[PDB]
Amino acid sequence: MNYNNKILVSESGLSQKHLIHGDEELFQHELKTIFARNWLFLTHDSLIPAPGDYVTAKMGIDEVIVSRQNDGSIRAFLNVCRHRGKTLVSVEAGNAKGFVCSYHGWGFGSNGELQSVPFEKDLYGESLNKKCLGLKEVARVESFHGFIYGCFDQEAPPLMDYLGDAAWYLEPMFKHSGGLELVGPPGKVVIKANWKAPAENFVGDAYHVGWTHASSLRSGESIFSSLAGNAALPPEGAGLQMTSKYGSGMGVLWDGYSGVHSADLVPELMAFGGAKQERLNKEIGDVRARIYRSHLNCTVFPNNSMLTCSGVFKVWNPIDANTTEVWTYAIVEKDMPEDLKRRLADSVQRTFGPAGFWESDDNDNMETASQNGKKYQSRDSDLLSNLGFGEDVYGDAVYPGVVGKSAIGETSYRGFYRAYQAHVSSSNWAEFEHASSTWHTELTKT
Amino acid sequence: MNYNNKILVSESGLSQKHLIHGDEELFQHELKTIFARNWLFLTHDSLIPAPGDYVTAKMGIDEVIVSRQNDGSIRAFLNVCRHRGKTLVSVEAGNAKGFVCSYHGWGFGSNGELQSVPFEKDLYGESLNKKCLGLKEVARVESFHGFIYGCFDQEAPPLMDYLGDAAWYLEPMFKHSGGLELVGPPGKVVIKANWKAPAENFVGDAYHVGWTHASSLRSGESIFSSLAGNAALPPEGAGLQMTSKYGSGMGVLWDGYSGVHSADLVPELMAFGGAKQERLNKEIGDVRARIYRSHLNCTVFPNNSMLTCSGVFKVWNPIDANTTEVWTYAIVEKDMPEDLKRRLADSVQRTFGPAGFWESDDNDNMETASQNGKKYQSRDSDLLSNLGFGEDVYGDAVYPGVVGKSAIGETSYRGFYRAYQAHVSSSNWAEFEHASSTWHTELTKT
Amino acid sequence: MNYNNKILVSESGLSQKHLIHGDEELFQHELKTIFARNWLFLTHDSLIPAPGDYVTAKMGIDEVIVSRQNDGSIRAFLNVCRHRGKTLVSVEAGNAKGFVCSYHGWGFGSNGELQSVPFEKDLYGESLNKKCLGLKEVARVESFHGFIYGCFDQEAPPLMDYLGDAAWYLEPMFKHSGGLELVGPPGKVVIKANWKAPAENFVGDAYHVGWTHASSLRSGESIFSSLAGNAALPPEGAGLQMTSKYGSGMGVLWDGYSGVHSADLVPELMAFGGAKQERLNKEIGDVRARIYRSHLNCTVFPNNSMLTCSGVFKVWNPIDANTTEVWTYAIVEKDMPEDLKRRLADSVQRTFGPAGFWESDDNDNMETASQNGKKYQSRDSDLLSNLGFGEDVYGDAVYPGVVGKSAIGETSYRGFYRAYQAHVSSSNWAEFEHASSTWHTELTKT
Amino acid sequence: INIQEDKLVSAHDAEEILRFFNCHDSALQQEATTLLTQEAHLLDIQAYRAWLEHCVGSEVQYQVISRELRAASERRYKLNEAMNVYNENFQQLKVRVEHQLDPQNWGNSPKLRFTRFITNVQAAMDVNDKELLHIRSNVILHRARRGNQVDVFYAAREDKWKRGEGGVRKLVQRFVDYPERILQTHNLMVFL
Amino acid sequence: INIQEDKLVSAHDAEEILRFFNCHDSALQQEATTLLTQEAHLLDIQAYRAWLEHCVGSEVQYQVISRELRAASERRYKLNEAMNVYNENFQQLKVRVEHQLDPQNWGNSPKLRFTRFITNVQAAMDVNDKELLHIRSNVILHRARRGNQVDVFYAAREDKWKRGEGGVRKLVQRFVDYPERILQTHNLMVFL
Amino acid sequence: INIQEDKLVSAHDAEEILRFFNCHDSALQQEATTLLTQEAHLLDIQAYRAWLEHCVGSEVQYQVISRELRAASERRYKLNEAMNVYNENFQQLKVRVEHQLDPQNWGNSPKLRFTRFITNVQAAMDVNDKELLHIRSNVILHRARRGNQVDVFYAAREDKWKRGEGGVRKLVQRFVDYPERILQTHNLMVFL
Numbered sequence A, B, C: 001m002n003y004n005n006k007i008l009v010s011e012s013g014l015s016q017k018h019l020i021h022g023d024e025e026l027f028q029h030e031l032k033t034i035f036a037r038n039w040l041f042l043t044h045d046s047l048i049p050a051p052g053d054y055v056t057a058k059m060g061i062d063e064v065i066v067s068r069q070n071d072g073s074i075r076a077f078l079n080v081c082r083h084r085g086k087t088l089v090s091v092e093a094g095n096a097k098g099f100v101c102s103y104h105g106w107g108f109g110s111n112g113e114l115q116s117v118p119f120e121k122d123l124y125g126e127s128l129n130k131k132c133l134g135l136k137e138v139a140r141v142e143s144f145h146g147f148i149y150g151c152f153d154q155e156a157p158p159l160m161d162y163l164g165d166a167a168w169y170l171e172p173m174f175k176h177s178g179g180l181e182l183v184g185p186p187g188k189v190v191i192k193a194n195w196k197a198p199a200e201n202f203v204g205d206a207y208h209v210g211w212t213h214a215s216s217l218r219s220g221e222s223i224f225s226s227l228a229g230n231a232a233l234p235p236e237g238a239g240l241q242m243t244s245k246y247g248s249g250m251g252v253l254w255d256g257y258s259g260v261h262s263a264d265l266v267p268e269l270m271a272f273g274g275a276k277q278e279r280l281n282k283e284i285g286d287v288r289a290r291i292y293r294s295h296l297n298c299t300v301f302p303n304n305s306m307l308t309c310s311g312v313f314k315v316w317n318p319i320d321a322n323t324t325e326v327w328t329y330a331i332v333e334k335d336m337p338e339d340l341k342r343r344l345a346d347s348v349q350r351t352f353g354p355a356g357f358w359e360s361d362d363n364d365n366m367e368t369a370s371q372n373g374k375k376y377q378s379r380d381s382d383l384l385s386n387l388g389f390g391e392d393v394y395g396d397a398v399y400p401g402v403v404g405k406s407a408i409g410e411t412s413y414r415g416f417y418r419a420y421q422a423h424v425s426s427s428n429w430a431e432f433e434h435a436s437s438t439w440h441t442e443l444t445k446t
Numbered sequence D, E, F: 001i002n003i004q005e006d007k008l009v010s011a012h013d014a015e016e017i018l019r020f021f022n023c024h025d026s027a028l029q030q031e032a033t034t035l036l037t038q039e040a041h042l043l044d045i046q047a048y049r050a051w052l053e054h055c056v057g058s059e060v061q062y063q064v065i066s067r068e069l070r071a072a073s074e075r076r077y078k079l080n081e082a083m084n085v086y087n088e089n090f091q092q093l094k095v096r097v098e099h100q101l102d103p104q105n106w107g108n109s110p111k112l113r114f115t116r117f118i119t120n121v122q123a124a125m126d127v128n129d130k131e132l133l134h135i136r137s138n139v140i141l142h143r144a145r146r147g148n149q150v151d152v153f154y155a156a157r158e159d160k161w162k163r164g165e166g167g168v169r170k171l172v173q174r175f176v177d178y179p180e181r182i183l184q185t186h187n188l189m190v191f192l
């Protein structure tokens, strides 16, 4: 397939070829043009707070070691020995000043340097150039309010610019709330879906909630529960959708601070969020303080998603075109009482974890939609994302980005897939920029 | 591999490259040139008799919904939602006026039309063109005496012409018997064989019976039992072989009406078939009435096989070059007493079903023959089908098609693979026809 | 990938691209340029001593039948029926005058000839040319002191020349000891590693022993046990490394006759080897008699490895780039007392068999090193084998081949991968020779 | 069980539960365990004639079904719900046993390896026929052959056993509703 | 067990061993086997309401954890070692049961098939609470759905059971430390 | 069993059947179940020293074989039929235990997870040695490690157990003929 010419996503992101969910050659091409190029979620400060603390993380199909340095910074390295390529670290988290390879015993520092080689003097003499044998380092590692992302491409925009117009929406909860903590360890489950299936669902799919999650809405007694079985449409002004230049996007459901949490947490949460909102009015204004306590379903392009307020935090780790390893963490606000944090974390896993009853509702939808992308008669068929097209705006006086001023639509699918196609057809960041110089105009046509 | 030029099947169908059973690129090419082009078995009238009745079926690797319309016709559609490609129907059979997608709730009619979209007015307004969003329809659906076949290619010959000279042999049992019923549900088992391995075996392999099925012949006490361990050759005139332009073919074993059925059904069956034969003499003539009560091992190209009288009905559903999902139904004559039909159905499954002891005899033969097609030293080796070559006739005064007037030979392999090669090397039906204008001459050479 | 031009192994064998352990296209190319071209281990005289005795063996991904002929010679044939390609022999060893196919009953002799065809006269008449339908024969089968190797390529060097300078090292144990026997049946286990990972480890990896096998060294109380956890370096003169033109190589650890065997066998073995060494001094000289009772870790290119004295004998049978089927036999000296042979065989399996506790130490090392070769950021990375480079010699007055006069180094990796690259980039043996005309000069540079 | 409230429960399954919750007899559960363990042993070592002679009643119905996947809400489509993978009387089991023992059953060389795991044994005498023993048990059946072929079967078995020749309890009915619709085990050629 | 000598043994595991090696009561082991077999039967037939009513105590904690992989020598990193796949009180189990029974749970059509194998049953009364029964058992849980989806779960269960309404022994705590870190079963939406 | 009639049955297997069909002692079957369940518990928690101390006799032979695939009709080829995956005396088991416990056994970090399922227990005293207990049982052994590595072993075990120190019954012989010829579990580094 010629990725320079092949129209995988139509103009304005209105449709995508179904093969994108099934084609293994395209998956291999995404490793290069999506995963090796873009910002990928690694960890949070709260999981590696002290010098020597480390975790392992996936970046695409690669595995990295992410380590807190003595100077307080974080560096990340390929989990691969520079000698004969054995996996260095076999655990998920810990604290160490270095990592020793179990094959021939080479010792690397937490800073990635090759520090020791068994019997170096007797064997290599002075001929081994250890300075050139440090672990392969992730070129870019940056933080968004404690959330640590990595990028293999030195040419990428800074993480903040990469978030584009999505940053404005995330800031009230990520920054102005006093800060979030990631509660680990994550749940980890393999699903037989393409990573784009859950990524697109979290970025902009409010339409599915009433129908897909009918049973969870009815059974769990949560705040969005009036929607079970499409019994009721969210009223006008119930929310909005947004998307951005580099692909990130989200839905906003006004005031839904208790999110998917069952009735057992609703009063406590609605009290807590409301109290902080009243304080934030004076600091960031009424609109932004309201966004703080509003439910955001967001994907940070390409494969990191979240539900704020619900506190669900997801990584869709790619394995192959029909296989994804799902990592699920909980996010909590630092200044919540510890007992509330504990119950919120359990509730995140109860609803969206390995045995998350809400998440289970999505299984067949994402797996079959992905697997159908391999089927002969469906490869060249068009997946539709045209809902709300012709009603999006850009440059609004209050809400930034390409914005659909309605709770339910496909605005964020369009921006997600516009960025995806621009990356797939580009050889580097400069080409992506050239392919994106009229990004918002393309999204707001008609 | 260049399929225009590559000789996968030699002149007159005398041999085939072993790689045809193992090569995944060729398997992908078959999805296009075999499965998307030819007639494939779907269901029987008896399984969807009433308006709203439906089943799911495979057509190649694609899945379709096959539905009885209000007007008594049958239409078939891809089991894929026109929105974001989720699998619409998750069951195997039922009755419904439509199908609702579990993702965003789009509702399609039994006629494939997009009938409803949740909150269409509020969300899409008048902008959603539902008339253009009907399920992807199977272009051609036709019946052969209640047996329903589908074809994705609008350019295909009518099913009756496609059956070619094989139709004459099938008619006494399929038509003149008063009609057959398919007894479901089918058994379903995955085997690690290429679909062509059982297809070629059913189309023309009488040679294997005495040796492969020695234990089943000896243990089951059936009518063809004198052959166990090659203890005895069928006498001269015991039967014949035939093949046809579009690939279908069969063996005929004279008078073997009780087929593979154990001695517990032999007297009843031989009485029933003989009685109907005596009636049919006056209607269709002695020869054709004899064919009615003669055992036919047939493949309807490409991947539907049957043993008449034994009542075995097979679909070899392709998964990959070494994986096939075997569907096994029973066929019964409508005017058989109900108790006989029930016992015949059980006996079909007893012998050739998921725990069919006869079918188990074939397992290693078909699996290893297929898997060896992947092995380096065997890929370019030649599978032989030359038995009886130079003794076939065409245009016989009594028996139509390319015919070998002997019970055991490889006549039907040759016609099967001649059609296969003509399809693989052709881009469309017109090219197949051009490649087949001297089909019978090629088969009867020397 | 263009294998003519692609530098997979750098000059002097100093590094290899990590992708060589993971790339499936390269694996397919190796079937042609490595496995179909080179000498592969089949069996030993001791396993098929009598006329009619046979075993099955893998040669690359192909399976062969290896049969003792009436005249005392050995011939090998593809385990594939010449009719429709079914696997002929389903057992691992036995005695027979021929092999009958379970599909249509064709009978082949132990000499590969098609001897019988059921009902040949009635079916084929005189038209079947059985003389042209013998099993596909392995072109070359030769013996090295009872050890039987095969080669599909008629153009290969004789086995003895192919062993090159490695033969001199093997002869004291293989020839001058009075002869070895292979004790079967082998253990058989699948590991998720590329075949080159254990092949390179056995050919030249003494460096890993103290660290990888720390627990086995400490627990088993063997003779090389001072090395556990890199507690001690082997003294100067403790051994050497060698490699050869056609890729075979080995490490030599002086005097280590009891090898990996636990203390329960050490006194008996050290007595036995010492006694035979004293006899051999007079016959082959002191140096070569010492080599007899010295521990050799050797790979016979490409995928047959052994530890002499320990008595471990390995075939790394390739399945795909990350899958290898490991066959483990024991070697014993013919003139050992039978009770010692029995205990030695059990000890080989105890340490290096399916539940070999030493072998288990290597699992993660070889599996992850291989699997990392598929990971995006590692494919183009360089595996290092530069230890000892610039200190190797060729043409030594005492020790032949390219030789590193030190116990621990990567000399044998370099010769192994030099031969590998020359084969991968060549279309035939003549081209390999042309690519190897300065093989030792390349290895001894700087 | 009220199946109007427990909406996922079938009438058949609710009936079978009821027979075991009533009179629990510990001695009977133990006898049943012995009976099934010995039966599994005979099958595992491929003593199929001994199995017939010692474990199988002359009036046996040995039945394994495969049920077509239907909508949970389905109420109109009323055609054959299941097919019989097995539905054997004694003579039909004997045919299958002879097929296993035939020296020209090529698939049985080299010899197959069977290992059965029998768990969850429950036993209850029939209410109306005090000589009819109901036994429920689950089986994991592992079949290995030809180096690297491994097939694992999983099933619940509803049995009836009755005293026959010499007072030996023998199988008079086995019913299995096989839980996997599409078999991924090459075939179901094993005695569950 | 001396865990200073048996270096791979956790303090928790050594404590649990101790409770079963002491007073062995054969009758108690048998009662426990019956209790767990009947519980598994109710779950297998998807009688989730009956399971709650007959098997689950009002004060239940139903907990399945997933433990982060840490170095065997790790002694400094002290952040949350595990997450809760399940950590349910009675009302939370009821929510999950209602979710299973809801007619708009699309994933449950066509009907799922469950088969449970319960083995290695051990039972011991608590030392301090003579009405608290400790029961240990292992489960293989086979779930089949949608033609060719097959998921097999494996776990050890540490239970506490106590006599409740009508004197019926009910589950007051189940603890499972799930042995596979990354699930290869699509989800853990089964009651272990 | 007449092995001339039951042609698939080996002389060895027919002999083993005979020892269990004779004197059935229910109490002995129960003792055996307890013994094997406690042994499996110690192994599952990786208390390998406790296993040696409490479960393994000083005169033990611990043997697991792999049998070469031969023709069912084979009668001439008479070379070694099997190899020993294990064939250990007490000191050799101790070596393996020390290897497991060694802090430089890198493969054991992060810690492995074992779950054993023991079924089909049969027990019979020896005819000639009234202190020798024959115990037969089947095991499913699940080993999980490193996030997504899962290996499942299946086997029948022929044991002899005898009263040793303090009157504690200990394993004096275990024999397993492993049913899979080519292992698909990376290794057989587990105590069956």
Ligand SMILES: CCc1ccccc1
Pocket (backbone or CB within 6 Å): A201, A202, A203, A204, A205, A206, A209, A224, A251, A260, A297, A307
């Ligand atoms: C409210 C839960 C949700 C999840 C994904 C997308 C939108 C909404």
Ligand SMILES: CCc1ccccc1
Pocket (backbone or CB within 6 Å): B201, B202, B203, B204, B205, B206, B209, B224, B251, B260, B297, B307
């Ligand atoms: C008579 C059974 C049979 C089956 C296939 C082919 C030919 C014949």
Ligand SMILES: CCc1ccccc1
Pocket (backbone or CB within 6 Å): C201, C202, C203, C204, C205, C206, C209, C224, C251, C260, C297, C307
């Ligand atoms: C001494 C064991 C060994 C094994 C492989 C390589 C070198 C050495």
Ligand code: FES
Pocket (backbone or CB within 6 Å): A081, A082, A083, A084, A085, A086, A101, A102, A103, A104, A105, A106
């Ligand atoms: S591979 Fe890491 S030290 Fe050699």
Ligand code: FES
Pocket (backbone or CB within 6 Å): B081, B082, B083, B084, B085, B086, B101, B102, B103, B104, B105, B106
């Ligand atoms: S995918 Fe079917 S309604 Fe959206």
Ligand code: FES
Pocket (backbone or CB within 6 Å): C081, C082, C083, C084, C085, C086, C101, C102, C103, C104, C105, C106
């Ligand atoms: S395939 Fe061997 S005889 Fe036909």
Ligand SMILES: [Fe+3]
Pocket (backbone or CB within 6 Å): A201, A208, A209, A212, A213, A358, A361, A362
């Ligand atoms: Fe959802």
Ligand SMILES: [Fe+3]
Pocket (backbone or CB within 6 Å): B201, B208, B209, B212, B213, B358, B361, B362
């Ligand atoms: Fe057949």
Ligand SMILES: [Fe+3]
Pocket (backbone or CB within 6 Å): C201, C208, C209, C212, C213, C358, C361, C362
């Ligand atoms: Fe090693």
